[model samples]
Target: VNSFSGYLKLTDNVYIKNADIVEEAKKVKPTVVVNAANVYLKHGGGVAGALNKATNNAMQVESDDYIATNGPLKVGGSCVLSGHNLAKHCLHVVGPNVNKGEDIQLLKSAYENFNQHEVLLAPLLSAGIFGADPIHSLRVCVDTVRTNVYLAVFDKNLYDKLVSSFL
Candidate 1:
């Protein structure tokens, strides 16, 4: 005794639906933008994410072209440069670590060092250590760099909330 219909009106959305998805998407690039989450997994074959330098690599720069962070240190995380994973720049930001909200300060400083010209990329797992909301984490990363923000989400609810102004 059930009737299934194709049309439904909706309004509410939350985070849990998207977080796992966003984490999954962080795994790779895509030939076609397949539902964000699936693309990363498909591209990486559910293993490793693919990374490629952006096409517009013509920007001029000073100092080293790479950089990294030392804090937001996940207890088990090692501060070392291995693959071009985690962040764009791989030189772990070994530092006098930061206070909780100091991400803004550190991020700004990093940009200034690049003459306010650089990009910062991160993973969902890393954000967990920073105590940053994945949504805010994505927003801050975009705001930090002079570029734009890009994010892939599995938690459909959280992803929607990121774009909405909650009351």
Candidate 2:
């Protein structure tokens, strides 16, 4: 099932499920896609790894450069990589660790960094491997997106759980 909410006339936020992130990336055709990553810019696991593969390693290469040039990212910080293979741009954010207290401000700042794009596909940052509660991350994501947002989840199980909790 698909669900949506409107943010004035600036954004149409959508929540939907997909078995695979790569396929969702293709279908949504988002101008930009956000990936959850660490300060090191490694894309070896989870959504970051999947995005690196989908973008034909472009995300990883550019991400490394971005980090190197700008210095390391603090939790809730982010940088953008333009024109990756799958999407026109990729927004990489360092999510808060599970043991750390919630940082909705960081998540909001990450979302705020994407002022150039009209359409964006973002995951529930810190909700998956990062160990944050799904509900908290989703709330922060929904509140922060200022443009069209496609809230994509790769796992159906997680999607169902999120939807159940959301409703």
Residues 1-167, candidate 1: write the lDDT tens digits: 11112211122211122333223233432111111111011122111222222212211110113222222432222232322322323222211123344333343333222222222222332233334355544443344434322234444565577556332
TM per model? 0.33, 0.79
Instruction: Go through the candidates in order and give each one's C-alpha lDDT.
Output: 0.28, 0.69
- Poorest stretch of ten by lDDT in candidate 2: 1-10
Tens digits of per-residue lDDT for model 2 on 1-167?
A: 22233212212554555446566666655667788878788888888888888778877788778767887877777777774666777778787766566564566566565445666677777877778777777766666665666776777787767676642
